[model samples]
Target chain A: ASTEKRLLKEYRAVKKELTEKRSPIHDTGIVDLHPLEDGLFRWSAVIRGPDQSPFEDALWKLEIDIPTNYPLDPPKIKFVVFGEEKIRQLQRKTSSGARKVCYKMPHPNVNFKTGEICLDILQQKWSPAWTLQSALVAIVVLLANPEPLSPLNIDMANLLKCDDTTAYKDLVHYYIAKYSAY
Target chain B: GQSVSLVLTQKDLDFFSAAYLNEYPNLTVILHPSVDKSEFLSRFNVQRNSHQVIQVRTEESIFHVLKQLSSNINLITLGNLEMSANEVETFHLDKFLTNVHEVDR
Candidate 1:
């Protein structure tokens, strides 16, 4: 009952703040979260790339799995891979299908293969004060500025480490350009 | 916070904000010239970094291929194709009928 009560407040707060059409935040379409069902544990979330960054103009769909204790434990979140379903949807527009677009996040802290994330807030930096919405905001910030020292995608991390801005930004742009909207 | 490196010069400066590392929202540090310098040193540095300098056709292609080989290493490590389709379960992006708020909860 306690968990449900607290989550209900947050769930409504997030919906009203970002999903309802009239909400000012909804106009930007920068962040959106939708519960999978009444349980309030699983959510399908979307956070747009911060403007002017290599990730800009691309939409990243993520999945959030919450713990029952509510704020006491952080939610486990990761990007949603573009599967066969997403591929089929795009087939109408492209002759090549999903061949060129890579669903991998391609971030230093994010595993390119599994989409698992490595961030202190999600781990040792845990605190009851953090909320799913704020954590997602942290992720958006993380994308614009990655922590290359702790990398999951060694290939991308190496580029950042060498201080070659062109290489790093180009690769990010290349992949996103191949799959612009999604 | 450790890896940002916002190295900038007046030549490189374009009124960009230091709020982000290449546009990230975090602790940012804008670096200045170590000893600092003159007009041609500043402008010339930007010119070479921004524009290409080459005079011949065949020589240009060789440099392009050399750099292209180094660049292609990035592609080699990406996309296994077989492993990406693991999230077999899918959803309708438009359907959010689940009452996310008040009265129903």
Candidate 2:
């Protein structure tokens, strides 16, 4: 099948599944997704800060770029907040728009300072079986529970290693309150 | 529009950029002090439409540089370095290596 047909097919399937209440991503209620330009190849994602986590009440936006060979290659996603001026202004525009803020996380290993995410499904672990919803939901999980085994932020990892949950949570909360703007 | 970062001291910058220029004789290399973390990270995150290279001074800068560019670079080189077993482990150097295509120590 042509790439466009397959992409649209996947898009429709995800939309229908979301509407049918059969998708687990809908259950999370944390992620909101939409196509960027009606092409379904480019998308925007919003993830409400996961409850009970330091990032709770914060909002995150992501740019999801589906490669022309997508499904064969996983979509590339980067948080929209990184490297942009007026980040504080964007963070405050929490309601929804083209200008949105994704969580500027201090998670030790899951996220880079530049807002690059380290997820297995997005890279070497990607498989054709996964869908857009799964990719998004996984992002939510990473936000709530950073994988400590390998961390991108060394200081955060050291705190977690020392078993200082309070310090870790406090630092993340401080980062969210200061940088996430909500 | 595109950029690469190197976190090295003044001497390191002097040496490494020379090696880089020798390798890619036509590319331009810019040397700047480590400013704020955002300034540093922003340069690395800029869209990669052309050749741009940055050299930063400080371990903090190096840490961010490695973390952000680990998967994006076509080449990476780690120069003379000394680290304890724990330093290597804590930095997650092994895992970061998985993302790199080539490394010269």
Candidate 3:
């Protein structure tokens, strides 16, 4: 029990120091951050997506996966933006549009059913020294540029590649209508 | 085209601008001095008119200064008992109010 308490105390001190001095933005939207059992940290960050982008009125949900050796390894981040029904519909590609469309999807990032995001910074590019605040800002900027190179939805990727404005506006506006209240 | 208007009484200067309020972009934020001094004086005076330590006398209407800030930002006070989240939500709602008021008021 003493060891556990000591570790938790150390964790709190490190967290405070990082939040105050090392954060990139003046307003870090971290409302809650709790370390869970089995090496996971449940963090809730309320970020106002960049106003210049299509996601102006949107608030993004960021999940951080902190390993046993944090501050040494970058936390894995996933943007949870879509619901299950929404994900399955977008991922399956059952319908045909300008390219090949299925159910018209609701959001840009995340698998509808799984709610997974394809942000590169969270993947192969994540550096061991990156902090949570830096990651949050990156996600905000990422919303402006959805990658089509290795897309989860081929049709959506094609839409982004070919006719982008229309597709981008639709997804952003739809989510704003549904989720902006929260 | 967008603007903010401040209401002021005697002996109080209304210092308001978009940068002043939007600096924190959070609920219950402490206002910055220097640039936004006018807004604080105006609002502080409006809150409690009990002690007439000061008075604002002007036909120029400080509302115009406020209108400019209102165009791009929001000016609101936090309730003593309110939480930060609710305070921020209030700021959000006030933005819509400013948008509407810009056209009419």
Candidate 4:
């Protein structure tokens, strides 16, 4: 709902900023958003991975489901790609649900059960002045750096903390291979 | 894809240095939560999902958002823009440049 205006504003800002600037990196677009048979909406996005980041040369899909709250709340965001090795590496070890992520997730301000994010600005941390551009930028940044501390997957969080170079490298590789446009 | 660059004013630097980084070191904590990027960027990607006061942890990120901004500005400003004789003399020869110049240039 809010995405109507919010999406417009975000598109304009990104266009203006990119127009005045030059870049080798491409901004991924919101790929698809449609109504499901049930009340649920399917949201999809792909970002050209930031250069030099572990996911470089990659195109990652972000699946989000907006709730009824509109501007008052945040949408759910999850990376749709689930490379088998990546899943194994995460050892997600969760019996509650599948490893898919969510936006404005069902979890507390901590680990989310649905691979959704639980950040302050998305929920109780929200402010009326916040824009889709800002939220997207925050999400873009998050891809490069998943909040393992406020983790949706505890095992992945601990592994990331324990040996990031090794664990993160694997995490990135799996997703990159699975999702890349190449 | 190539990394883009931009110029940042002192105020811009100040905002990122203080407000942005302090509040969003989550950017830092997310970028490299463990490995110390030397004095440039102290890593901290380890403590995901946990909530602890991280306001003062701004200096830990190796990304050095300010450094990146300033560098971007430095590159952008290198173009051949026409300047007044007085303006050129004031900036190039003056020993005591303005704080803004120092912050950005």
Q: TM-score of each candidate?
A: 0.57, 0.54, 0.43, 0.41
lDDT of 1 by residue, B50-93 (tens): 11111111211222222221221111100212234433422311
Q: In angstroms, how far off is A146's CA in candidate 2?
A: 1.7
Error of 4 at A7 (Å): 4.5
Show the colliding residue pairs in model 2: A60-A102, A61-A102, A108-A152, A108-A153, A109-A151, A109-A152, B2-B48
- Candidate 4 lDDT, B1-105, residue by residue in tens: 111222222232222232323343222212222222232123323223122111111211111221211121222222222222323212211132222343342
The per-prediction CA RMSD against the true structure, in angstroms, equals 18.5, 13.4, 19.7, 20.1
Q: Candidate 2 residues A24-49, lDDT tens each?
A: 65556435677877676898777766
Better of 1 and 4 by TM-score: 1
Point to the candidate with the largest TM-score: 1
Better of 2 and 4 by TM-score: 2
TM-score of 2: 0.54
Please, what are the lDDT tens digits per residue for candidate 1 over residues A57-165? 6778788888988678888988876643464466456555422433547688997646788889998587888877778878888888899899877656765655645
Ranking 1 against 2 by lDDT, winner: 2
lDDT of 4 by residue, A1-182 (tens): 55556644544555555554344223532222333344444444545444556545544445666656555666666655443345444444445452233221111123323445656667667665775445555655655666666755454455445443443443345333322231
Worst 10 residues of 1 chain A by lDDT: A173-182
> How many angstroms is residue A72 displaced in model 1 relative to the true structure, after the best TM-score fit?
1.3
Please write out the lDDT profile of model 3 over residues B60-79, one tens digit for every residue: 11221222122343333322
Model 3 residue A72 CA deviation in Å: 4.3
Residue A78 of model 4, lDDT score: 61
Candidate 2 stretches with Cα past 4 Å from truth are A13-24, A83-85, A91-103, B1-105
